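Recap quiz, item 2
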Amino acid sequence: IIGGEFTTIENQPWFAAIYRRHRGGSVTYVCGGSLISPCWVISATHCFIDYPKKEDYIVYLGRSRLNSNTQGEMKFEVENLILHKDYSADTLAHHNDIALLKIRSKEGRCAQPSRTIQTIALPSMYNDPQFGTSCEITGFGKEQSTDYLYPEQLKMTVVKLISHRECQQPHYYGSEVTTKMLCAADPQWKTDSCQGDSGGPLVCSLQGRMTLTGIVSWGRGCALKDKPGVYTRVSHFLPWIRSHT
Ligand SMILES: *C(=O)c1ccc(NC(=N)N)cc1
């Protein structure tokens, strides 16, 4: 997260921290995700495409810190890693950038809700907030494009939804953005998602309910003028989620 503020898991209790075990046993952070039901975390296919083996992955819920255990956290194996079979990636844009992880602890159990573990509601089909709406993004991604390290503490920021029209403009993304993507950015371009934030949630309040409107997907750099963050438009993927859960 470029700019924004530090947070703890209590403020985004659906947030999933996804890590990969490397050959040799070393564990590195991969991507965020969101808990949509006790047994299901939703993320981005781009996070997993180079290493598609479900056994390589570890999912935490209730975790506020990157490389320290948060009190109350729960740790899961991935029992099913479902990548979108129509996923495609150009030099920047990711298409159908959506993935489902069925989670199962060593004791053979799904998430158990708590102060630090809750589900996030899915949108109603094609039901998205109007452009200019303020939404929140959460992740362990870089605080600056030039950073080597990821923050140890979880971060959040606010970005505003941008219309398909505006995002299609020449100096923005042109035809790279489709109607299955949502753009969001800061008016001053001062806060954004960055490397490490992908797979994570874009949450909007829709008719009074906190809704997973988006999945952090792609962008040209981070917090660059006329280069919004691009999100998987979740309200356009309900059939795929339905048929795989
Ligand atoms: C994901 O890792 C990711 C998503 C989006 C960006 N860029 C912007 N939001 N501009 C970088 C990395």
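The CA atoms of residues 62 and 109 lie 15 Å apart.
The helical segments are 164-168, 238-244.
End of item.
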